[PDB]
Design a protein around this ligand. Structure first.
Ligand SMILES: [Cl-]
Ligand SMILES: [Cl-]
Ligand SMILES: [Mg+2]
Ligand SMILES: [Mg+2]
Ligand SMILES: [Mg+2]
Ligand SMILES: [Mg+2]
Ligand SMILES: [Mg+2]
Ligand SMILES: [Mg+2]
Ligand SMILES: [Mg+2]
Ligand SMILES: [Mg+2]
Ligand SMILES: [Mg+2]
Ligand SMILES: [Mg+2]
Ligand SMILES: [Mg+2]
Ligand SMILES: [Mg+2]
Ligand SMILES: [Mg+2]
Ligand code: NA
Ligand code: NA
Ligand code: NA
Ligand code: NA
Ligand code: NA
Ligand code: NA
Ligand code: NA
Ligand code: NA
Ligand code: NA
Ligand code: NA
Ligand code: NA
Ligand SMILES: [Sr+2]
Ligand SMILES: [Sr+2]
Ligand SMILES: [Sr+2]
Ligand SMILES: [Sr+2]
Ligand SMILES: [Sr+2]
Ligand SMILES: [Sr+2]
Ligand SMILES: [Sr+2]
Ligand SMILES: [Sr+2]
Ligand SMILES: [Sr+2]
Ligand SMILES: [Sr+2]
Ligand SMILES: [Sr+2]
Ligand SMILES: [Sr+2]
Ligand SMILES: [Sr+2]
Ligand SMILES: [Sr+2]
Ligand SMILES: [Sr+2]
Ligand SMILES: [Sr+2]
Ligand SMILES: [Sr+2]
Ligand SMILES: [Sr+2]
Ligand SMILES: [Sr+2]
Ligand SMILES: [Sr+2]
Ligand SMILES: [Sr+2]
Ligand SMILES: [Sr+2]
Ligand SMILES: [Sr+2]
Ligand SMILES: [Sr+2]
Ligand SMILES: [Sr+2]
Ligand SMILES: [Sr+2]
Lengths: 143, 56, 81, 46, 82
RNA sequence: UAUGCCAGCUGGUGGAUUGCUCGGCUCAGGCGCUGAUGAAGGACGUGCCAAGCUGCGAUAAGCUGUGGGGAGC
RNA sequence: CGUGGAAGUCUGUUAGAGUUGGUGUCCUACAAUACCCUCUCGUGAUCUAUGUGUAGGGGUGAAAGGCCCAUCGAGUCCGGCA
RNA sequence: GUCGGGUGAGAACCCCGACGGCCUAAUGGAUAAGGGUUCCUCAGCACUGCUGAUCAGCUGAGGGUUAGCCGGUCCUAAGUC
RNA sequence: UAGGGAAACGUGAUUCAACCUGGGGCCCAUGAAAAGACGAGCAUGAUGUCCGUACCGAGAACCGACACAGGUGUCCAUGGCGGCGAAAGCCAAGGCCUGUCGGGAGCAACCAACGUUAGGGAAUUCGGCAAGUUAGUCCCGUACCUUCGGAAGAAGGGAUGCC
RNA sequence: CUGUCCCAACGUUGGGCCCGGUGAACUGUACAUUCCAGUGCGGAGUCUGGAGACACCCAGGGGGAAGCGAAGACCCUAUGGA
């Protein structure tokens, strides 16, 4: 008894993979008489032809590792593979840092803290990279 | 890459096709000229005296 | 002069269109258009054709799937012939 | 490869040339198809 | 009917990546020799097949506890894991 | 006497030989142009069942007329 | 010090292209030029598909007398031809 | 691959389940060229299949390719007639 | 109050292919054309013929005489962990057990791939052929020479997990 | 740095060996169980003389058949070719 045709029809009607269809080992003769697509549909509702479930890669261990790396752990010098400029991009780090300092000095000019001349002094120096972070910018504004 | 068996892989071109005039697979569809009857080159039919031994 | 309708295509799928969808299948002459197949079917069976779908079979002949209107029934036409 | 109308008419006939000599011709001649073509072993036109 | 421990230490002769296949041949041979029947007569229940193919095809167990029966006209046996 | 050697015997394998000839080869006489009124050639069709060939052309192994012929096809 | 992001630049079995050594495997082959490890290039004079052009004493040739359908110090077929 | 089981005159290799593996730019998906019916069903094992075959791209006979809006068709390119 | 779903038939977020739109730089290289569309409305009705449409698309549907370990273009380059990575390794979705003959012998010699070999360490050989050693990332450090570009990852030294 | 060597050992997988099935080819003047000498166109399983030699079969590594494979590319010759 060849049920390979029905296996092709079962996988289209259940819209699932060919390797996932299950045929009841006890109902072979009744699956053998299954000529049409409707014959296959009826045999699905009878429970004789079912579909197995698709597996998923259990992210359980991954999530518990995402926790520790976000806290600063496991990123030791024996777990780094790519070079430094590969782990964090230099041009992208500047974009992050400099906009952060250009978002600061803007909020200071439009508040009255800094004057048009004091803002210019710092913007050109920020663009010149005289300040490391926003914290070093503040440690310069305050005398 | 050797000129033999592996160069035979790049052979998926159609050149000689069934002619309209004579019917031999000799119509070069890229040249629009027949190599058997000469359709597309001559108004006459391609016949040659060397297609038979001199005194025949 | 060539005739349009040659003979009816009477296969199992030609019944699945006759019963369910009210369509008559004919194997017509390959020089015929959808509009020529249409007029021809009407002038031979006293029916009203709405749509004609053609295909050039692997037998060199042209298969014409002719859809009738609600007023005419395909199962009733295939009876007399 | 895209076939044309004529190319189709031709490949169509070549398929009917692939039919066996009917059972009755054997009984009429009182006892071979020579244009026996296979889709793999043989080569057609075009 | 009795319970026999089948040693599979002769499966280490057949190449590692096939160890499970030979293990199954050994069981069938061991039972036919002890219950006095033919190799064709011995029917193994899929339990023995899953027990032997547990850790892949190459890391098959060294022994196996097995429960077998003995009956019928020609003479045959049905066998399973304990 | 196992493996085996030479000759024969029955039976194969093989298709020579002999017999036969729907084909060839050569000679001789007769005859001798076709095509835009679309030839020659080709393709695709054409049969109750039709694959090859022959014929034929959508009127498709055939339609008309005159003569021959004749109970068959 | 930074910003910038150049290159017949760099590492790279990324796709891809090439083919140094093993003078390994094979050598009535898987194959009338193959297998495997190694090795080279990999933003450029780069690699590739399809279309198209150049024809035999002629093309094409970063030139090896290389390539022009397993045919090249003058392609192939048929004829001259016995 | 293995143990069960199915069909069968006949089963290591046809089919069901289970257990066990292989493939991750491909051994998955869609296609161009080229192939030309090789697609589908039924019936088969003289042929073909690196063994066997109840299977098959094999053999035999049916069935199958439906578009105003997907290609073609139109345009022009190197270039060709 | 289409559809689909056994059911629920979500809401927010980051990084964002495609797709949209800008800024910049290079050339002794300057990066197609044409048909068509836009310019330039709306209603109702009609018409829209013809050709392709099956399947393969490859370790069996193509080319290589073969069900050939060869050759042959395109799109999927964002499936999960991984890690710089379209890298390795493992795993989905999906496909397969047809790179299609099997059974048996602790299974010898001998051969192909290959692992580990004490002490010595190139004595082997034409020649370190073969195999091997080093190896990613971080920090310290880096000679001669140099066309000032480079040499240079010179060399050398330290570090490297888990909680 | 190391099995390249001194110097070889054990192991691993696919073969190899036995059983089923499938099922080619290279080569064949004839005879042919050889060996030691000799002789011969001076490089003999086959001639002469001796020696040896019961037949068949399995596995083997290849000493011999001036082994198989290719009308020597070297060399000379031809009133040869390019
Ligand atoms: Cl298309
Ligand atoms: Cl900008
Ligand atoms: Mg069947
Ligand atoms: Mg920078
Ligand atoms: Mg159409
Ligand atoms: Mg057919
Ligand atoms: Mg080396
Ligand atoms: Mg080109
Ligand atoms: Mg030279
Ligand atoms: Mg389909
Ligand atoms: Mg195969
Ligand atoms: Mg040692
Ligand atoms: Mg020495
Ligand atoms: Mg010379
Ligand atoms: Mg000369
Ligand atoms: Na073919
Ligand atoms: Na005449
Ligand atoms: Na005229
Ligand atoms: Na006929
Ligand atoms: Na600078
Ligand atoms: Na190589
Ligand atoms: Na020439
Ligand atoms: Na098989
Ligand atoms: Na990822
Ligand atoms: Na070793
Ligand atoms: Na020898
Ligand atoms: Sr190659
Ligand atoms: Sr090509
Ligand atoms: Sr011309
Ligand atoms: Sr002439
Ligand atoms: Sr048909
Ligand atoms: Sr072929
Ligand atoms: Sr470069
Ligand atoms: Sr590189
Ligand atoms: Sr060499
Ligand atoms: Sr070779
Ligand atoms: Sr090697
Ligand atoms: Sr790059
Ligand atoms: Sr000649
Ligand atoms: Sr049989
Ligand atoms: Sr099939
Ligand atoms: Sr963005
Ligand atoms: Sr399709
Ligand atoms: Sr495909
Ligand atoms: Sr391939
Ligand atoms: Sr899977
Ligand atoms: Sr097979
Ligand atoms: Sr050890
Ligand atoms: Sr040395
Ligand atoms: Sr030395
Ligand atoms: Sr170091
Ligand atoms: Sr031998």
């Amino acid at each position: 008894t060849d049920l390979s045709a029905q296996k092709r029809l079962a996988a289209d009607v259940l819209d699932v993979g060919k390797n996932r269809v299950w045929f009841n080992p006890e109902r072979q003769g009744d699956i053998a008489d299954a000529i049409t697509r409707e014959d296959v549909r009826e045999l699905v509702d009878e429970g004789a032809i079912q579909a197995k479930d698709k597996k998923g890669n259990s992210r359980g261990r991954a999530r518990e590792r995402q926790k520790k790396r976000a806290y600063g752990h496991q990123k030791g010098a024996g777990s780094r593979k790519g070079k430094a400029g590969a782990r964090q991009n230099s041009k992208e780090d500047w974009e992050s840092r400099i906009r952060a300092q250009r978002t600061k000095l803007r909020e200071l000019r439009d508040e009255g803290t800094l004057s048009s001349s004091q803002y210019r002094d710092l913007y050109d120096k920020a663009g010149g990279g005289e300040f490391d972070s926003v914290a070093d910018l503040e440690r310069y504004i305050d005398a | 890459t050797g000129a033999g068996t592996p160069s035979q892989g790049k052979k998926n071109t159609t050149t000689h096709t069934k002619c309209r005039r004579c019917g031999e697979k000799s119509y070069h569809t890229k040249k629009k000229v027949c190599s058997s009857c000469g359709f597309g080159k001559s108004a006459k039919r391609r016949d040659y005296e060397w297609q038979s031994k001199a005194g025949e | 002069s060539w005739d349009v309708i040659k003979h009816p295509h009477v296969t199992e799928k030609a019944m699945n269109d006759m019963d369910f969808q009210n369509k008559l299948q004919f194997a017509v002459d390959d020089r015929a258009s959808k509009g020529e197949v249409a007029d021809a079917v009407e002038e031979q069976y006293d029916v009203t054709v709405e749509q004609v779908n053609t295909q050039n079979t692997m037998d060199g002949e042209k298969k014409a799937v002719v859809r009738l209107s609600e007023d005419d029934d395909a199962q009733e036409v295939a009876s007399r012939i | 490869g895209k076939k044309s109308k004529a190319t189709k008419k031709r490949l169509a006939k070549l398929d009917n040339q692939n039919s066996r000599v009917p059972a009755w011709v054997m009984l009429k001649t009182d006892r071979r198809n020579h244009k026996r073509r296979h889709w793999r072993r043989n080569d057609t036109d075009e | 009917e009795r319970v026999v421990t089948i040693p599979l230490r002769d499966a280490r002769a057949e190449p590692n990546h096939k160890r499970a296949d030979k293990a199954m041949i050994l069981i069938r041979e061991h039972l036919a020799k002890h219950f006095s029947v033919d190799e064709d007569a011995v029917r193994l229940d899929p339990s023995i097949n899953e027990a032997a193919w547990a850790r892949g095809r190459a890391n098959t167990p060294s022994k196996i506890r097995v429960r077998a029966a003995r009956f019928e006209e020609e003479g045959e046996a049905i066998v399973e894991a304990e």
